[PDB]
């Protein structure tokens, strides 16, 4: 029901949910991470590595729910992480979220 470009911003401190759909909202794709583990599992990598032979492409990843476009106005409310393995294993409890 909602195209991938739409963005939902949750404002915690003041209860305001602002959703934007107009054009120009510069955005970029990121991987999703449910609890401490990515949704991009070996299955996806395998199917994708066999692309250009069958039909597999980025749209498959976007539909499967592994990647997601975040726009700058929504990027301010997401605990981003640099590399999957390094920043999640187990250490002093930084954010773990």
């Amino acid at each position: 029901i909602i195209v991938s470009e739409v963005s939902m911003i949750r404002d915690i401190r003041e209860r305001e949910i602002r959703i934007y759909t107009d054009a120009g909202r510069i955005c970029r794709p990121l991987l999703i991470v449910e609890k401490q583990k990515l949704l991009l599992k070996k299955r996806h990598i395998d199917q994708l590595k066999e692309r250009e032979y069958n039909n597999y492409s980025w749209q498959d990843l976007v539909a499967s729910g592994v990647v997601e476009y975040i726009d700058t106005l929504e990027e301010e409310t997401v605990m981003l992480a640099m590399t999957p393995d390094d920043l999640q294993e187990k250490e002093v409890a930084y954010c773990s979220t």
Binding site: I12, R13, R15, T77, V78, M79, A93, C95, S96, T97
Partner: protein, 116 residues
């Protein structure tokens, strides 16, 4: 103590104060209506130069469910006694000079807040 606006009963407008010269008392009138009522607070205006505002009254429980807010276990709640809790600064402009935290308990139905 503070003073809160009290609106008229018929016209539902701002009620100004008035000192009853005859009965020597404090009344609240309406600019438009002729509604009168005997005052009880016996105060009109107060100014807080220091602006001593309790940040706890501004913090809300919903902050707990925030994915970009640090979490600690060393400051368990009081009422529920849960372990997980979040902490953050005043996050309010015009912060005079303080980074005193405001811990908020991390659990449903508790919404407890405290400072150390």
């Amino acid at each position: 103590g503070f003073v809160g606006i009290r609106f008229c009963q018929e016209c539902n407008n701002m009620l100004y104060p008035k000192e009853d010269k005859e009965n020597r008392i404090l009344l609240y009138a309406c600019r438009n209506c002729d509604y009168q009522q005997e005052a009880d607070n016996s105060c009109i205006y107060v100014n807080k130069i220091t602006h001593e505002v309790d940040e706890l009254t501004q913090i809300i429980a919903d902050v707990s469910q925030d994915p970009t807010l640090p979490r600690t276990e060393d400051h368990p709640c009081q009422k529920c006694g849960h372990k997980e809790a979040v902490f953050f600064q005043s996050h309010s402009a015009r912060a005079e000079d303080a980074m005193r935290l405001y811990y908020v308990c991390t659990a449903p139905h508790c919404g407890h807040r405290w400072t150390e």
